[PDB]
Amino acid sequence: DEKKSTAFQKKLEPAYQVSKGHKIRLTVELADHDAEVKWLKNGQEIQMSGSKYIFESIGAKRTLTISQCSLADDAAYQCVVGGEKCSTELFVKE
């Protein structure tokens, strides 16, 4: 089940609004703070890449920078550490 459990102290609101092609960031307050965060596309498991699923960290608050994601990747992106996922819906804004 996708649910708070993940090493994300707080996962951001379950509706991330990507500014299409502007690269949407998946901001969370990490529980780990400085751990490599893996993320999930609804059903799809999302690793990390310097082109998509970009990991970025600010003061524990972890961020998944997703590039090339606009009026197509409109769906849901969960957040995952090791193998723990918390669901968040992904909506794209043009």
GROMACS .gro file of C-alpha atoms in nm:
model
   94
    1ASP     CA    1   0.000   0.000   0.000
    2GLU     CA    2   0.116   0.351  -0.080
    3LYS     CA    3   0.098   0.533   0.252
    4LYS     CA    4   0.306   0.736   0.497
    5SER     CA    5   0.574   0.499   0.612
    6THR     CA    6   0.844   0.599   0.375
    7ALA     CA    7   1.157   0.765   0.507
    8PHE     CA    8   0.991   1.086   0.402
    9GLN     CA    9   0.912   1.270   0.721
   10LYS     CA   10   0.657   1.454   0.519
   11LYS     CA   11   0.568   1.387   0.157
   12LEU     CA   12   0.433   1.699  -0.015
   13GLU     CA   13   0.061   1.733  -0.096
   14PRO     CA   14  -0.073   1.434  -0.299
   15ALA     CA   15  -0.099   1.651  -0.610
   16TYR     CA   16   0.226   1.778  -0.753
   17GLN     CA   17   0.163   2.026  -1.035
   18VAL     CA   18   0.440   2.009  -1.294
   19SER     CA   19   0.502   2.320  -1.495
   20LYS     CA   20   0.510   2.136  -1.823
   21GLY     CA   21   0.864   2.089  -1.947
   22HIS     CA   22   0.979   2.326  -1.672
   23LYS     CA   23   1.076   2.009  -1.484
   24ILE     CA   24   0.864   1.933  -1.179
   25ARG     CA   25   1.039   1.882  -0.847
   26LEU     CA   26   0.910   1.630  -0.592
   27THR     CA   27   0.969   1.809  -0.265
   28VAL     CA   28   0.947   1.620   0.063
   29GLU     CA   29   1.070   1.660   0.415
   30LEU     CA   30   1.294   1.358   0.451
   31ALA     CA   31   1.312   1.147   0.763
   32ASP     CA   32   1.652   1.021   0.651
   33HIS     CA   33   1.747   1.376   0.553
   34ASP     CA   34   2.052   1.269   0.352
   35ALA     CA   35   1.952   0.945   0.188
   36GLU     CA   36   1.922   0.864  -0.181
   37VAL     CA   37   1.554   0.889  -0.259
   38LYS     CA   38   1.395   0.669  -0.518
   39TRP     CA   39   1.055   0.760  -0.647
   40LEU     CA   40   0.765   0.578  -0.798
   41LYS     CA   41   0.546   0.646  -1.097
   42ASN     CA   42   0.195   0.514  -1.037
   43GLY     CA   43   0.278   0.145  -1.064
   44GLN     CA   44   0.617   0.216  -1.229
   45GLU     CA   45   0.925   0.215  -1.010
   46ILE     CA   46   1.135   0.526  -1.051
   47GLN     CA   47   1.511   0.524  -0.987
   48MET     CA   48   1.732   0.831  -1.036
   49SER     CA   49   1.896   0.996  -1.336
   50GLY     CA   50   2.059   1.325  -1.436
   51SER     CA   51   1.787   1.370  -1.697
   52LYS     CA   52   1.475   1.243  -1.523
   53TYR     CA   53   1.412   1.143  -1.161
   54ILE     CA   54   1.684   1.385  -1.053
   55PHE     CA   55   1.762   1.370  -0.682
   56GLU     CA   56   1.808   1.704  -0.507
   57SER     CA   57   1.827   1.780  -0.135
   58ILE     CA   58   1.764   2.096   0.062
   59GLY     CA   59   1.804   2.095   0.441
   60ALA     CA   60   1.674   1.738   0.477
   61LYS     CA   61   1.388   1.833   0.248
   62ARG     CA   62   1.444   1.603  -0.041
   63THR     CA   63   1.338   1.682  -0.392
   64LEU     CA   64   1.290   1.470  -0.701
   65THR     CA   65   1.354   1.690  -1.002
   66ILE     CA   66   1.169   1.537  -1.294
   67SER     CA   67   1.261   1.663  -1.638
   68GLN     CA   68   1.080   1.588  -1.965
   69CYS     CA   69   0.749   1.551  -1.792
   70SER     CA   70   0.461   1.758  -1.898
   71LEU     CA   71   0.126   1.697  -2.069
   72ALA     CA   72   0.202   1.324  -2.077
   73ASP     CA   73   0.346   1.215  -1.741
   74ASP     CA   74   0.026   1.353  -1.585
   75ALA     CA   75  -0.058   1.074  -1.339
   76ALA     CA   76   0.088   0.994  -0.996
   77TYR     CA   77   0.441   0.981  -0.853
   78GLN     CA   78   0.500   0.797  -0.525
   79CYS     CA   79   0.812   0.841  -0.314
   80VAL     CA   80   1.038   0.563  -0.206
   81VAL     CA   81   1.340   0.484   0.006
   82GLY     CA   82   1.486   0.135  -0.012
   83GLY     CA   83   1.146  -0.008  -0.096
   84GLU     CA   84   0.890   0.209   0.079
   85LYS     CA   85   0.644   0.411  -0.136
   86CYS     CA   86   0.406   0.696  -0.053
   87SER     CA   87   0.172   0.802  -0.332
   88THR     CA   88   0.132   1.153  -0.462
   89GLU     CA   89  -0.071   1.248  -0.767
   90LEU     CA   90   0.099   1.427  -1.052
   91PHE     CA   91  -0.084   1.695  -1.247
   92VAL     CA   92   0.079   1.894  -1.522
   93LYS     CA   93   0.022   2.262  -1.584
   94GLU     CA   94   0.097   2.388  -1.934
   0.00000   0.00000   0.00000
